[PDB]
């Protein structure tokens, strides 16, 4: 392997370098539609998915997996990964979700899911989550979320490697040993809520598909069916 050899800093550098760009939406302030907004997010997600896929290839250890396994991990984690990216860039925008630099929405503009995303972002804010910690968490989601649905053992070694990285970061931040373990748990418990939001998100997306008011891209549709069968 190549991922099992990296230092903590090399791990962080690799992840930081592999970050996807922040995409813009097709939003128009002049133009007015509840269904159109979902169309905007759906289009945004579809373009983000392409970058996510090329981001995943650069996650240490991911390419070591079979294609069938890579496919499974992304099918399971894609909405979680989109959502944690959203809450991250929404951190310094209290009470609002920054879907894109030109699409900044508050709850007044689905309601429940927005509230959870807002609380998650708000949680990241008071924790003062660091970018280095974010990239670690995002990669943990990719590797962990589908690991339970040989090739499985290697994934756990990489996960442990990422845990060592998070601890190394915190120790460098000046946290005591007790503080390091506490923060670590705090970050990992948040992934449970992200799992939950994703689950609730998938069910709503499946609702939109049948309703047919909002049209889904061919990739999101395939990603969506992956959670029904």
């Amino acid at each position: 392997s190549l991922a099992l050899s990296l230092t903590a800093d090399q791990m962080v550098s690799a992840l930081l370098d592999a970050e996807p760009p922040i995409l813009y939406s097709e939003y128009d302030p002049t133009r007015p539609s509840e269904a159109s907004m979902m169309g905007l997010l759906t289009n945004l997600a579809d373009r983000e998915l392409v970058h996510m896929i090329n981001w995943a290839k650069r996650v240490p250890g991911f390419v070591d997996l079979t294609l069938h396994d890579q496919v499974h991990l992304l099918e399971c984690a894609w909405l979680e990964i989109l959502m944690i990216g959203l809450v991250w860039r929404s951190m310094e925008h209290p009470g609002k979700l920054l879907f894109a630099p030109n699409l900044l929405l508050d709850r007044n503009q689905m309601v429940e899911i927005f509230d959870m995303l807002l609380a998650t972002s708000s949680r990241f804010r008071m924790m003062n989550l660091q970018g280095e910690e974010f990239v670690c968490l995002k990669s943990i989601i990719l590797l962990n979320s589908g690991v339970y649905t040989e090739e499985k053992d290697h994934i756990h070694r990489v996960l442990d490697k990422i845990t060592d990285t998070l601890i190394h970061l915190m120790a460098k931040a000046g946290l005591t040993l007790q503080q390091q373990h506490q923060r670590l748990a705090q970050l990992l418990l948040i992934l449970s809520h992200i799992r939950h939001m994703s689950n609730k998100g998938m069910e709503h997306l499946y609702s939109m598909k049948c309703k047919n008011v909002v049209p889904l891209s061919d990739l999101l549709l395939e990603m969506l069916d992956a959670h029904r069968l």
Partner: peptide, 9 residues
């Protein structure tokens, strides 16, 4: 499978 193809390239 769109996802599989993109991963392959």
């Amino acid at each position: 499978k769109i996802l599989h193809r993109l991963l392959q390239d």
